[PDB]
Design an enzyme around this catalytic site. Sequence first.
Site, PDB file in Angstrom:
ATOM      1  N   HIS A   8       0.874  -1.161   0.000  1.00  0.00           N
ATOM      2  CA  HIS A   8       0.000   0.000   0.000  1.00  0.00           C
ATOM      3  C   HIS A   8       0.916   1.218   0.000  1.00  0.00           C
ATOM      4  O   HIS A   8       1.642   1.446   0.971  1.00  0.00           O
ATOM      5  CB  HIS A   8      -0.894  -0.030   1.234  1.00  0.00           C
ATOM      6  CG  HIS A   8      -1.892   1.078   1.298  1.00  0.00           C
ATOM      7  ND1 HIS A   8      -2.939   1.177   0.413  1.00  0.00           N
ATOM      8  CD2 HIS A   8      -2.016   2.123   2.150  1.00  0.00           C
ATOM      9  CE1 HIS A   8      -3.670   2.235   0.718  1.00  0.00           C
ATOM     10  NE2 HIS A   8      -3.128   2.825   1.769  1.00  0.00           N
ATOM     11  N   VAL A  34      -0.189   1.419  13.565  1.00  0.00           N
ATOM     12  CA  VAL A  34       0.289   0.040  13.518  1.00  0.00           C
ATOM     13  C   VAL A  34      -0.053  -0.693  14.804  1.00  0.00           C
ATOM     14  O   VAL A  34      -0.327  -1.899  14.788  1.00  0.00           O
ATOM     15  CB  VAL A  34       1.804   0.015  13.251  1.00  0.00           C
ATOM     16  CG1 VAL A  34       2.354  -1.380  13.474  1.00  0.00           C
ATOM     17  CG2 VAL A  34       2.091   0.463  11.855  1.00  0.00           C
ATOM     18  N   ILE A  37      -4.365  -1.204  14.435  1.00  0.00           N
ATOM     19  CA  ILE A  37      -5.057  -1.827  13.312  1.00  0.00           C
ATOM     20  C   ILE A  37      -4.381  -3.165  13.029  1.00  0.00           C
ATOM     21  O   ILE A  37      -3.220  -3.174  12.591  1.00  0.00           O
ATOM     22  CB  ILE A  37      -5.037  -0.922  12.076  1.00  0.00           C
ATOM     23  CG1 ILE A  37      -5.710   0.410  12.417  1.00  0.00           C
ATOM     24  CG2 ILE A  37      -5.724  -1.615  10.891  1.00  0.00           C
ATOM     25  CD1 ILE A  37      -5.744   1.378  11.278  1.00  0.00           C
ATOM     26  N   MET A  40      -2.274  -3.846   9.642  1.00  0.00           N
ATOM     27  CA  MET A  40      -1.099  -3.053   9.295  1.00  0.00           C
ATOM     28  C   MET A  40       0.162  -3.779   9.746  1.00  0.00           C
ATOM     29  O   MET A  40       0.421  -3.884  10.946  1.00  0.00           O
ATOM     30  CB  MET A  40      -1.189  -1.684   9.960  1.00  0.00           C
ATOM     31  CG  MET A  40      -1.718  -0.589   9.120  1.00  0.00           C
ATOM     32  SD  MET A  40      -1.756   0.938  10.083  1.00  0.00           S
ATOM     33  CE  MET A  40      -0.560   1.934   9.200  1.00  0.00           C
ATOM     34  N   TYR A  75      -8.098  -2.207   6.746  1.00  0.00           N
ATOM     35  CA  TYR A  75      -7.440  -1.022   7.289  1.00  0.00           C
ATOM     36  C   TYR A  75      -8.200   0.251   6.918  1.00  0.00           C
ATOM     37  O   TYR A  75      -8.402   1.127   7.768  1.00  0.00           O
ATOM     38  CB  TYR A  75      -5.983  -1.027   6.812  1.00  0.00           C
ATOM     39  CG  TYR A  75      -5.313   0.296   6.538  1.00  0.00           C
ATOM     40  CD1 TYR A  75      -5.430   0.906   5.298  1.00  0.00           C
ATOM     41  CD2 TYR A  75      -4.518   0.893   7.489  1.00  0.00           C
ATOM     42  CE1 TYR A  75      -4.806   2.094   5.022  1.00  0.00           C
ATOM     43  CE2 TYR A  75      -3.881   2.087   7.223  1.00  0.00           C
ATOM     44  CZ  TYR A  75      -4.032   2.678   5.986  1.00  0.00           C
ATOM     45  OH  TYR A  75      -3.415   3.883   5.708  1.00  0.00           O
ATOM     46  N   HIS A  78     -11.259   0.453   9.208  1.00  0.00           N
ATOM     47  CA  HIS A  78     -11.039   0.360  10.644  1.00  0.00           C
ATOM     48  C   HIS A  78     -11.343   1.708  11.291  1.00  0.00           C
ATOM     49  O   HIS A  78     -10.947   2.745  10.762  1.00  0.00           O
ATOM     50  CB  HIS A  78      -9.596  -0.044  10.948  1.00  0.00           C
ATOM     51  CG  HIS A  78      -9.366  -0.382  12.386  1.00  0.00           C
ATOM     52  ND1 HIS A  78      -9.295   0.576  13.378  1.00  0.00           N
ATOM     53  CD2 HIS A  78      -9.239  -1.578  13.007  1.00  0.00           C
ATOM     54  CE1 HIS A  78      -9.112  -0.018  14.544  1.00  0.00           C
ATOM     55  NE2 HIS A  78      -9.090  -1.326  14.348  1.00  0.00           N
TER      56      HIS A  78
HETATM   57  C1  LIG Z   1      -0.462   9.037   5.674  1.00  0.00           C
HETATM   58  C2  LIG Z   1      -1.678   9.406   4.827  1.00  0.00           C
HETATM   59  C3  LIG Z   1      -2.946   8.702   5.307  1.00  0.00           C
HETATM   60  C4  LIG Z   1      -4.105   8.867   4.327  1.00  0.00           C
HETATM   61  C5  LIG Z   1      -5.398   8.215   4.817  1.00  0.00           C
HETATM   62  C6  LIG Z   1      -6.299   7.875   3.629  1.00  0.00           C
HETATM   63  C7  LIG Z   1      -7.288   8.778   3.278  1.00  0.00           C
HETATM   64  C8  LIG Z   1      -8.120   8.525   2.202  1.00  0.00           C
HETATM   65  O1  LIG Z   1      -9.124   9.441   1.855  1.00  0.00           O
HETATM   66  C9  LIG Z   1      -7.960   7.367   1.467  1.00  0.00           C
HETATM   67  C10 LIG Z   1      -6.967   6.464   1.808  1.00  0.00           C
HETATM   68  O2  LIG Z   1      -6.816   5.298   1.051  1.00  0.00           O
HETATM   69  C11 LIG Z   1      -6.130   6.708   2.887  1.00  0.00           C
HETATM   70  C12 LIG Z   1      -5.060   5.670   3.223  1.00  0.00           C
HETATM   71  O3  LIG Z   1      -4.636   4.909   2.321  1.00  0.00           O
HETATM   72  O4  LIG Z   1      -4.618   5.530   4.393  1.00  0.00           O
END
Ligand SMILES: CCCCCc1cc(O)cc(O)c1C(=O)O
Lengths: 104, 104
Positions: A8, A34, A37, A40, A75, A78
Amino acid sequence: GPGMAVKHLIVLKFKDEITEAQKEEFIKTYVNLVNIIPAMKDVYWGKDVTQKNKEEGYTHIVEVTFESVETIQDYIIHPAHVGFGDVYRSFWEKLLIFDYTPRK
Amino acid sequence: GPGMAVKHLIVLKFKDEITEAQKEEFIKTYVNLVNIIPAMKDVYWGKDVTQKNKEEGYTHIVEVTFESVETIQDYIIHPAHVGFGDVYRSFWEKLLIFDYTPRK
Ligand SMILES: CCCCCc1cc(O)cc(O)c1C(=O)O
Ligand SMILES: CCCCCc1cc(O)cc(O)c1C(=O)O
Protein backbone atom coordinates in the site's frame (compact mmCIF):
# COMPACT_ATOMS: atom_id res chain seq x y z
CA GLY A 1 10.08 -16.37 0.52
CA PRO A 2 7.43 -17.46 -1.99
CA GLY A 3 4.77 -15.23 -0.43
CA MET A 4 2.47 -12.93 -2.37
CA ALA A 5 1.93 -9.93 -0.09
CA VAL A 6 0.63 -6.55 -1.28
CA LYS A 7 2.12 -3.07 -0.79
CA HIS A 8 0.00 0.00 0.00
CA LEU A 9 1.78 3.13 -1.26
CA ILE A 10 0.64 6.63 -0.28
CA VAL A 11 1.99 9.78 -1.98
CA LEU A 12 1.09 13.02 -0.23
CA LYS A 13 1.25 16.77 -0.81
CA PHE A 14 0.29 18.84 2.23
CA LYS A 15 -1.46 22.19 1.98
CA ASP A 16 0.97 25.10 1.88
CA GLU A 17 -0.10 26.40 5.29
CA ILE A 18 0.88 23.15 7.06
CA THR A 19 4.10 23.62 9.01
CA GLU A 20 6.96 21.15 9.15
CA ALA A 21 6.19 20.46 12.81
CA GLN A 22 2.57 19.73 11.90
CA LYS A 23 3.65 17.31 9.15
CA GLU A 24 5.87 15.54 11.67
CA GLU A 25 2.98 15.15 14.13
CA PHE A 26 0.75 13.88 11.32
CA ILE A 27 3.28 11.21 10.39
CA LYS A 28 3.89 10.26 14.02
CA THR A 29 0.19 9.75 14.69
CA TYR A 30 -0.21 7.79 11.45
CA VAL A 31 2.62 5.38 12.29
CA ASN A 32 0.92 4.80 15.65
CA LEU A 33 -1.93 3.12 13.77
CA VAL A 34 0.29 0.04 13.52
CA ASN A 35 -0.35 -0.59 17.22
CA ILE A 36 -4.14 -0.41 16.73
CA ILE A 37 -5.06 -1.83 13.31
CA PRO A 38 -4.39 -5.60 13.02
CA ALA A 39 -3.98 -5.56 9.22
CA MET A 40 -1.10 -3.05 9.30
CA LYS A 41 2.13 -5.07 9.15
CA ASP A 42 4.88 -2.45 8.83
CA VAL A 43 5.31 1.21 7.88
CA TYR A 44 8.14 3.13 6.24
CA TRP A 45 7.98 6.77 5.22
CA GLY A 46 10.22 9.25 3.50
CA LYS A 47 10.49 12.84 2.33
CA ASP A 48 11.38 13.49 -1.29
CA VAL A 49 14.70 15.25 -1.80
CA THR A 50 14.88 15.91 -5.57
CA GLN A 51 11.68 17.97 -6.15
CA LYS A 52 11.34 16.99 -9.81
CA ASN A 53 7.55 17.10 -10.28
CA LYS A 54 6.92 20.81 -10.91
CA GLU A 55 3.21 21.57 -10.43
CA GLU A 56 2.62 18.14 -8.79
CA GLY A 57 4.79 18.77 -5.76
CA TYR A 58 4.14 15.74 -3.60
CA THR A 59 6.63 15.61 -0.73
CA HIS A 60 5.91 12.53 1.40
CA ILE A 61 5.87 8.81 0.61
CA VAL A 62 4.44 6.17 2.96
CA GLU A 63 4.64 2.42 2.31
CA VAL A 64 2.73 -0.22 4.28
CA THR A 65 2.83 -3.98 3.72
CA PHE A 66 -0.39 -5.99 3.93
CA GLU A 67 -1.29 -9.64 3.43
CA SER A 68 -3.81 -8.84 0.65
CA VAL A 69 -6.03 -6.21 -0.95
CA GLU A 70 -8.83 -7.41 1.33
CA THR A 71 -6.82 -6.56 4.43
CA ILE A 72 -5.89 -3.17 2.96
CA GLN A 73 -9.64 -2.67 2.76
CA ASP A 74 -9.95 -3.74 6.43
CA TYR A 75 -7.44 -1.02 7.29
CA ILE A 76 -9.39 1.57 5.26
CA ILE A 77 -12.61 0.99 7.23
CA HIS A 78 -11.04 0.36 10.64
CA PRO A 79 -12.43 3.05 12.99
CA ALA A 80 -8.95 4.29 13.93
CA HIS A 81 -8.18 4.81 10.25
CA VAL A 82 -11.56 6.44 9.53
CA GLY A 83 -11.04 8.73 12.51
CA PHE A 84 -7.51 9.67 11.45
CA GLY A 85 -8.61 10.36 7.90
CA ASP A 86 -11.63 12.43 8.96
CA VAL A 87 -9.74 14.79 11.26
CA TYR A 88 -6.62 15.19 9.10
CA ARG A 89 -8.32 15.35 5.69
CA SER A 90 -7.85 19.12 5.54
CA PHE A 91 -4.07 18.64 5.89
CA TRP A 92 -3.49 17.48 2.34
CA GLU A 93 -3.94 19.04 -1.08
CA LYS A 94 -3.13 15.96 -3.18
CA LEU A 95 -3.19 12.26 -2.32
CA LEU A 96 -2.36 9.24 -4.47
CA ILE A 97 -2.89 5.62 -3.38
CA PHE A 98 -1.50 2.48 -5.01
CA ASP A 99 -1.99 -1.16 -4.05
CA TYR A 100 0.27 -3.61 -5.86
CA THR A 101 2.40 -6.72 -5.57
CA PRO A 102 6.04 -5.87 -6.36
CA ARG A 103 7.67 -8.02 -9.02
CA LYS A 104 10.85 -8.33 -11.08
CA GLY B 1 22.19 -1.29 8.97
CA PRO B 2 25.72 -0.91 7.61
CA GLY B 3 24.53 -0.23 4.06
CA MET B 4 23.02 3.07 3.01
CA ALA B 5 20.40 3.30 0.31
CA VAL B 6 18.08 5.74 -1.42
CA LYS B 7 14.89 4.69 -3.17
CA HIS B 8 14.12 6.09 -6.62
CA LEU B 9 10.37 5.88 -7.15
CA ILE B 10 8.68 6.23 -10.55
CA VAL B 11 4.89 6.55 -10.93
CA LEU B 12 3.59 6.21 -14.48
CA LYS B 13 0.43 6.46 -16.59
CA PHE B 14 0.74 5.11 -20.12
CA LYS B 15 -1.04 6.75 -23.00
CA ASP B 16 -4.43 5.19 -23.66
CA GLU B 17 -3.49 3.78 -27.05
CA ILE B 18 -0.40 1.94 -25.76
CA THR B 19 -0.92 -1.82 -25.94
CA GLU B 20 -0.22 -4.35 -23.23
CA ALA B 21 2.48 -5.74 -25.52
CA GLN B 22 4.06 -2.29 -25.68
CA LYS B 23 3.90 -1.94 -21.90
CA GLU B 24 5.66 -5.29 -21.54
CA GLU B 25 8.42 -4.19 -23.95
CA PHE B 26 8.84 -0.91 -22.07
CA ILE B 27 9.10 -2.62 -18.70
CA LYS B 28 11.43 -5.42 -19.84
CA THR B 29 13.79 -2.92 -21.40
CA TYR B 30 13.74 -0.74 -18.29
CA VAL B 31 14.44 -3.60 -15.89
CA ASN B 32 17.28 -4.70 -18.20
CA LEU B 33 19.07 -1.41 -17.47
CA VAL B 34 20.52 -3.08 -14.36
CA ASN B 35 22.77 -4.94 -16.86
CA ILE B 36 23.95 -1.63 -18.32
CA ILE B 37 23.93 0.89 -15.44
CA PRO B 38 25.69 -0.65 -12.42
CA ALA B 39 24.38 2.04 -10.07
CA MET B 40 20.95 0.34 -10.23
CA LYS B 41 21.04 -2.24 -7.44
CA ASP B 42 17.44 -3.55 -7.49
CA VAL B 43 14.36 -2.91 -9.61
CA TYR B 44 10.84 -3.87 -8.56
CA TRP B 45 7.67 -2.81 -10.30
CA GLY B 46 3.95 -3.32 -10.02
CA LYS B 47 0.53 -2.37 -11.33
CA ASP B 48 -2.06 -0.76 -9.06
CA VAL B 49 -5.15 -2.92 -8.57
CA THR B 50 -7.39 -0.51 -6.61
CA GLN B 51 -7.77 2.31 -9.15
CA LYS B 52 -8.82 4.96 -6.61
CA ASN B 53 -6.90 7.99 -7.99
CA LYS B 54 -9.91 9.62 -9.61
CA GLU B 55 -8.09 12.87 -10.37
CA GLU B 56 -4.97 11.49 -12.10
CA GLY B 57 -5.07 7.86 -13.29
CA TYR B 58 -1.53 6.64 -12.58
CA THR B 59 -1.27 2.83 -12.98
CA HIS B 60 2.34 1.65 -12.68
CA ILE B 61 4.97 1.86 -9.94
CA VAL B 62 8.70 1.26 -10.42
CA GLU B 63 11.10 1.25 -7.46
CA VAL B 64 14.89 1.29 -7.93
CA THR B 65 17.39 1.00 -5.08
CA PHE B 66 20.56 3.09 -5.23
CA GLU B 67 23.46 3.60 -2.84
CA SER B 68 23.20 7.42 -2.81
CA VAL B 69 21.77 10.48 -4.51
CA GLU B 70 25.17 10.74 -6.23
CA THR B 71 24.75 7.40 -7.93
CA ILE B 72 21.17 8.33 -8.85
CA GLN B 73 22.68 11.31 -10.67
CA ASP B 74 25.07 8.98 -12.51
CA TYR B 75 22.05 6.94 -13.61
CA ILE B 76 20.11 10.00 -14.80
CA ILE B 77 22.87 11.20 -17.15
CA HIS B 78 23.96 7.76 -18.29
CA PRO B 79 23.63 7.49 -22.09
CA ALA B 80 21.46 4.36 -21.80
CA HIS B 81 19.05 6.24 -19.55
CA VAL B 82 18.92 9.15 -21.98
CA GLY B 83 18.46 6.59 -24.74
CA PHE B 84 15.63 4.90 -22.87
CA GLY B 85 13.87 8.25 -22.92
CA ASP B 86 14.73 8.71 -26.59
CA VAL B 87 12.80 5.57 -27.48
CA TYR B 88 10.07 5.36 -24.81
CA ARG B 89 9.15 8.90 -23.74
CA SER B 90 6.28 8.75 -26.22
CA PHE B 91 4.75 5.88 -24.21
CA TRP B 92 3.73 7.76 -21.04
CA GLU B 93 1.10 10.43 -20.52
CA LYS B 94 2.07 11.25 -16.92
CA LEU B 95 5.14 10.62 -14.77
CA LEU B 96 6.16 11.34 -11.17
CA ILE B 97 9.72 10.90 -9.85
CA PHE B 98 10.75 10.74 -6.17
CA ASP B 99 14.02 10.10 -4.34
CA TYR B 100 13.89 9.34 -0.63
CA THR B 101 15.48 7.37 2.18
CA PRO B 102 12.82 5.18 3.81
CA ARG B 103 12.74 5.38 7.58
CA LYS B 104 10.66 4.26 10.54
C1 LIG C 1 -0.46 9.04 5.67
C2 LIG C 1 -1.68 9.41 4.83
C3 LIG C 1 -2.95 8.70 5.31
C4 LIG C 1 -4.10 8.87 4.33
C5 LIG C 1 -5.40 8.21 4.82
C6 LIG C 1 -6.30 7.87 3.63
C7 LIG C 1 -7.29 8.78 3.28
C8 LIG C 1 -8.12 8.53 2.20
O1 LIG C 1 -9.12 9.44 1.86
C9 LIG C 1 -7.96 7.37 1.47
C10 LIG C 1 -6.97 6.46 1.81
O2 LIG C 1 -6.82 5.30 1.05
C11 LIG C 1 -6.13 6.71 2.89
C12 LIG C 1 -5.06 5.67 3.22
O3 LIG C 1 -4.64 4.91 2.32
O4 LIG C 1 -4.62 5.53 4.39
C1 LIG D 1 10.36 3.54 -16.25
C2 LIG D 1 10.01 5.02 -16.15
C3 LIG D 1 10.85 5.88 -17.09
C4 LIG D 1 11.24 7.23 -16.48
C5 LIG D 1 12.55 7.78 -17.05
C6 LIG D 1 12.69 9.22 -16.55
C7 LIG D 1 12.18 10.21 -17.35
C8 LIG D 1 12.24 11.53 -16.96
O1 LIG D 1 11.71 12.53 -17.77
C9 LIG D 1 12.82 11.86 -15.75
C10 LIG D 1 13.33 10.87 -14.94
O2 LIG D 1 13.90 11.23 -13.73
C11 LIG D 1 13.27 9.54 -15.32
C12 LIG D 1 13.87 8.48 -14.40
O3 LIG D 1 14.15 8.79 -13.22
O4 LIG D 1 14.13 7.32 -14.83
